[PDB]
mmCIF file with all atom_site columns, C-alpha atoms in Angstrom:
data_model
loop_
_atom_site.group_PDB
_atom_site.id
_atom_site.type_symbol
_atom_site.label_atom_id
_atom_site.label_alt_id
_atom_site.label_comp_id
_atom_site.label_asym_id
_atom_site.label_entity_id
_atom_site.label_seq_id
_atom_site.pdbx_PDB_ins_code
_atom_site.Cartn_x
_atom_site.Cartn_y
_atom_site.Cartn_z
_atom_site.occupancy
_atom_site.B_iso_or_equiv
_atom_site.pdbx_formal_charge
_atom_site.auth_seq_id
_atom_site.auth_comp_id
_atom_site.auth_asym_id
_atom_site.auth_atom_id
_atom_site.pdbx_PDB_model_num
ATOM 1  C CA . UNK A 1 1  ? -6.770 -5.438  -21.838 1.00 59.98 ? 18 UNK A CA 1
ATOM 2  C CA . UNK A 1 2  ? -3.215 -5.026  -20.542 1.00 60.31 ? 19 UNK A CA 1
ATOM 3  C CA . UNK A 1 3  ? -3.993 -4.801  -16.796 1.00 61.49 ? 20 UNK A CA 1
ATOM 4  C CA . UNK A 1 4  ? -4.989 -8.343  -15.780 1.00 56.66 ? 21 UNK A CA 1
ATOM 5  C CA . UNK A 1 5  ? -1.540 -9.747  -16.606 1.00 57.26 ? 22 UNK A CA 1
ATOM 6  C CA . UNK A 1 6  ? -0.058 -7.919  -13.608 1.00 57.26 ? 23 UNK A CA 1
ATOM 7  C CA . UNK A 1 7  ? -2.055 -10.333 -11.410 1.00 58.98 ? 24 UNK A CA 1
ATOM 8  C CA . UNK A 1 8  ? -2.358 -13.467 -13.570 1.00 58.81 ? 25 UNK A CA 1
ATOM 9  C CA . UNK A 1 9  ? 1.360  -13.942 -14.132 1.00 59.42 ? 26 UNK A CA 1
ATOM 10 C CA . UNK A 1 10 ? 1.196  -17.713 -14.722 1.00 62.57 ? 27 UNK A CA 1
ATOM 11 C CA . UNK A 1 11 ? -0.575 -17.024 -18.031 1.00 63.47 ? 28 UNK A CA 1
ATOM 12 C CA . UNK A 1 12 ? 2.206  -14.692 -19.230 1.00 64.49 ? 29 UNK A CA 1
ATOM 13 C CA . UNK A 1 13 ? 5.054  -16.057 -21.338 1.00 62.69 ? 30 UNK A CA 1
ATOM 14 C CA . UNK A 1 14 ? 7.908  -17.284 -19.107 1.00 64.72 ? 31 UNK A CA 1
ATOM 15 C CA . UNK A 1 15 ? 6.048  -15.821 -16.082 1.00 64.01 ? 32 UNK A CA 1
ATOM 16 C CA . UNK A 1 16 ? 8.129  -12.675 -16.624 1.00 62.24 ? 33 UNK A CA 1
ATOM 17 C CA . UNK A 1 17 ? 6.895  -9.706  -14.605 1.00 59.81 ? 34 UNK A CA 1
ATOM 18 C CA . UNK A 1 18 ? 8.890  -7.430  -16.913 1.00 56.43 ? 35 UNK A CA 1
ATOM 19 C CA . UNK A 1 19 ? 6.470  -8.284  -19.722 1.00 58.41 ? 36 UNK A CA 1
ATOM 20 C CA . UNK A 1 20 ? 3.429  -7.260  -17.682 1.00 56.86 ? 37 UNK A CA 1
ATOM 21 C CA . UNK A 1 21 ? 2.070  -3.732  -17.279 1.00 58.24 ? 38 UNK A CA 1
ATOM 22 C CA . UNK A 1 22 ? 1.612  -2.629  -13.656 1.00 57.22 ? 39 UNK A CA 1
ATOM 23 C CA . UNK A 1 23 ? -0.103 0.647   -12.789 1.00 61.74 ? 40 UNK A CA 1
ATOM 24 C CA . UNK A 1 24 ? 1.614  2.560   -9.998  1.00 61.36 ? 41 UNK A CA 1
ATOM 25 C CA . UNK A 1 25 ? 1.930  6.125   -8.753  1.00 64.37 ? 42 UNK A CA 1
ATOM 26 C CA . UNK A 1 26 ? 5.390  7.745   -8.897  1.00 62.29 ? 43 UNK A CA 1
ATOM 27 C CA . UNK A 1 27 ? 4.828  9.531   -5.571  1.00 62.99 ? 44 UNK A CA 1
ATOM 28 C CA . UNK A 1 28 ? 2.875  6.817   -3.747  1.00 59.08 ? 45 UNK A CA 1
ATOM 29 C CA . UNK A 1 29 ? 5.661  4.366   -4.629  1.00 63.12 ? 46 UNK A CA 1
ATOM 30 C CA . UNK A 1 30 ? 7.836  5.884   -1.883  1.00 61.38 ? 47 UNK A CA 1
ATOM 31 C CA . UNK A 1 31 ? 5.710  4.378   0.899   1.00 58.17 ? 48 UNK A CA 1
ATOM 32 C CA . UNK A 1 32 ? 5.375  0.937   -0.764  1.00 60.41 ? 49 UNK A CA 1
ATOM 33 C CA . UNK A 1 33 ? 8.228  -0.888  0.983   1.00 61.09 ? 50 UNK A CA 1
ATOM 34 C CA . UNK A 1 34 ? 6.580  -4.101  2.275   1.00 60.29 ? 51 UNK A CA 1
ATOM 35 C CA . UNK A 1 35 ? 5.082  -7.109  0.495   1.00 61.81 ? 52 UNK A CA 1
ATOM 36 C CA . UNK A 1 36 ? 1.888  -9.036  1.340   1.00 61.23 ? 53 UNK A CA 1
ATOM 37 C CA . UNK A 1 37 ? 1.100  -6.744  4.254   1.00 59.80 ? 54 UNK A CA 1
ATOM 38 C CA . UNK A 1 38 ? -2.485 -6.905  5.614   1.00 57.82 ? 55 UNK A CA 1
ATOM 39 C CA . UNK A 1 39 ? -4.768 -4.219  4.206   1.00 59.12 ? 56 UNK A CA 1
ATOM 40 C CA . UNK A 1 40 ? -6.242 -3.916  7.680   1.00 60.39 ? 57 UNK A CA 1
ATOM 41 C CA . UNK A 1 41 ? -2.793 -3.453  9.203   1.00 60.40 ? 58 UNK A CA 1
ATOM 42 C CA . UNK A 1 42 ? -1.878 -0.767  6.662   1.00 60.45 ? 59 UNK A CA 1
ATOM 43 C CA . UNK A 1 43 ? -4.985 1.334   7.216   1.00 61.56 ? 60 UNK A CA 1
ATOM 44 C CA . UNK A 1 44 ? -4.915 0.749   10.984  1.00 60.78 ? 61 UNK A CA 1
ATOM 45 C CA . UNK A 1 45 ? -1.307 1.941   11.085  1.00 58.67 ? 62 UNK A CA 1
ATOM 46 C CA . UNK A 1 46 ? -2.161 5.120   9.171   1.00 60.90 ? 63 UNK A CA 1
ATOM 47 C CA . UNK A 1 47 ? -5.286 5.836   11.238  1.00 61.61 ? 64 UNK A CA 1
ATOM 48 C CA . UNK A 1 48 ? -3.495 5.083   14.516  1.00 63.20 ? 65 UNK A CA 1
ATOM 49 C CA . UNK A 1 49 ? -0.642 7.397   13.575  1.00 60.17 ? 66 UNK A CA 1
ATOM 50 C CA . UNK A 1 50 ? -3.174 10.141  12.902  1.00 57.49 ? 67 UNK A CA 1
ATOM 51 C CA . UNK A 1 51 ? -4.869 9.458   16.251  1.00 61.56 ? 68 UNK A CA 1
ATOM 52 C CA . UNK A 1 52 ? -1.600 9.287   18.195  1.00 60.92 ? 69 UNK A CA 1
ATOM 53 C CA . UNK A 1 53 ? -0.504 12.641  16.805  1.00 60.34 ? 70 UNK A CA 1
ATOM 54 C CA . UNK A 1 54 ? -3.952 14.223  17.267  1.00 59.51 ? 71 UNK A CA 1
ATOM 55 C CA . UNK A 1 55 ? -4.113 13.261  20.946  1.00 60.08 ? 72 UNK A CA 1
ATOM 56 C CA . UNK A 1 56 ? -0.603 14.660  21.380  1.00 58.71 ? 73 UNK A CA 1
ATOM 57 C CA . UNK A 1 57 ? -1.356 17.992  19.686  1.00 53.92 ? 74 UNK A CA 1
ATOM 58 C CA . UNK A 1 58 ? -5.049 18.826  20.168  1.00 50.19 ? 75 UNK A CA 1
ATOM 59 C CA . UNK A 1 59 ? -5.598 17.069  23.518  1.00 49.62 ? 76 UNK A CA 1
ATOM 60 C CA . UNK A 1 60 ? -2.089 17.396  25.041  1.00 49.18 ? 77 UNK A CA 1
ATOM 61 C CA . UNK A 1 61 ? -1.696 13.617  25.248  1.00 49.25 ? 78 UNK A CA 1
ATOM 62 C CA . UNK A 1 62 ? -4.727 13.157  27.535  1.00 50.44 ? 79 UNK A CA 1
ATOM 63 C CA . UNK A 1 63 ? -7.165 10.553  26.225  1.00 47.68 ? 80 UNK A CA 1
ATOM 64 C CA . UNK A 1 64 ? -9.648 11.349  29.010  1.00 47.93 ? 81 UNK A CA 1
#
């Protein structure tokens, strides 16, 4: 049970994040550059980027 401390930091000694164990992906960590971003905003940005490139490539920029 070493995972909950990453969230419940007030219960850790001295509230030191360095004591806690935080699970993170070495490759996915590149794109983690913002804090407290909305989950909706993150997934909307990714989906909208996919859509904006798909309309450009497959449909030649024509939404009609």
